[PDB]
Motif scaffolding. Structure first.
Motif, PDB file in Angstrom:
ATOM      1  N   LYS A  89     -12.462  -8.832  45.800  1.00  0.00           N
ATOM      2  CA  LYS A  89     -11.756  -8.067  44.785  1.00  0.00           C
ATOM      3  C   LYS A  89     -12.738  -7.915  43.504  1.00  0.00           C
ATOM      4  O   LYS A  89     -13.670  -8.608  43.506  1.00  0.00           O
ATOM      5  N   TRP A  90     -12.374  -6.891  42.982  1.00  0.00           N
ATOM      6  CA  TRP A  90     -13.640  -6.287  41.875  1.00  0.00           C
ATOM      7  C   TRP A  90     -15.310  -6.224  42.341  1.00  0.00           C
ATOM      8  O   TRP A  90     -15.774  -6.498  41.602  1.00  0.00           O
ATOM      9  N   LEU A 107      -5.825  -1.907  48.492  1.00  0.00           N
ATOM     10  CA  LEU A 107      -6.562  -1.914  47.160  1.00  0.00           C
ATOM     11  C   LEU A 107      -7.255  -0.758  46.995  1.00  0.00           C
ATOM     12  O   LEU A 107      -7.890  -0.082  47.914  1.00  0.00           O
ATOM     13  N   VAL A 156      -9.776  -2.674  43.818  1.00  0.00           N
ATOM     14  CA  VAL A 156      -8.903  -3.365  42.651  1.00  0.00           C
ATOM     15  C   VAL A 156      -7.455  -3.411  43.341  1.00  0.00           C
ATOM     16  O   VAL A 156      -6.852  -2.543  43.542  1.00  0.00           O
ATOM     17  N   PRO A 157      -6.851  -4.603  43.831  1.00  0.00           N
ATOM     18  CA  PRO A 157      -5.731  -4.733  44.362  1.00  0.00           C
ATOM     19  C   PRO A 157      -4.533  -4.226  43.569  1.00  0.00           C
ATOM     20  O   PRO A 157      -4.537  -4.689  42.324  1.00  0.00           O
ATOM     21  N   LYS A 158      -3.568  -3.481  44.095  1.00  0.00           N
ATOM     22  CA  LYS A 158      -2.488  -2.949  43.528  1.00  0.00           C
ATOM     23  C   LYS A 158      -1.772  -4.314  42.699  1.00  0.00           C
ATOM     24  O   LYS A 158      -1.941  -4.213  41.534  1.00  0.00           O
ATOM     25  N   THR A 159      -0.982  -4.786  43.287  1.00  0.00           N
ATOM     26  CA  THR A 159      -0.225  -6.083  42.804  1.00  0.00           C
ATOM     27  C   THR A 159      -0.998  -7.176  42.560  1.00  0.00           C
ATOM     28  O   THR A 159      -1.972  -7.605  43.195  1.00  0.00           O
ATOM     29  N   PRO A 160      -0.808  -7.770  41.369  1.00  0.00           N
ATOM     30  CA  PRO A 160      -1.465  -8.948  40.688  1.00  0.00           C
ATOM     31  C   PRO A 160      -0.929 -10.253  41.382  1.00  0.00           C
ATOM     32  O   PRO A 160      -1.569 -10.728  42.366  1.00  0.00           O
ATOM     33  N   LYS A 161      -0.131 -10.916  40.436  1.00  0.00           N
ATOM     34  CA  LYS A 161       0.477 -12.171  40.883  1.00  0.00           C
ATOM     35  C   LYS A 161       1.216 -12.296  42.041  1.00  0.00           C
ATOM     36  O   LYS A 161       1.119 -12.735  43.105  1.00  0.00           O
ATOM     37  N   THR A 162       2.644 -11.813  41.535  1.00  0.00           N
ATOM     38  CA  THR A 162       3.441 -11.450  42.951  1.00  0.00           C
ATOM     39  C   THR A 162       3.652 -10.087  43.459  1.00  0.00           C
ATOM     40  O   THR A 162       3.866  -9.114  42.579  1.00  0.00           O
TER      41      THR A 162
END
Length: 40
Positions: free
Chosen positions: A6-7, A21, A34-40
């Motif tokens: 990521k990033w 992403l 960049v991944p759509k969802t972060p934590k959950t």
């Protein structure tokens, strides 16, 4: 091999992100997945 970090730059096929992403292009430099969802 592990998925696309990521990033990380978009180099290598330009847009070969792992999951759903999206590769965001900076001002001049390349883009970074960049991944759509972060934590959950």
């Amino acid at each position: 091999e592990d998925c696309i970090p990521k990033w990380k730059g978009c180099v290598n096929r330009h847009g070969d992100c792992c999951e759903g992403l999206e590769c965001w292009k900076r001002r001049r430099s390349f883009e970074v997945c960049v991944p759509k969802t972060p934590k959950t």
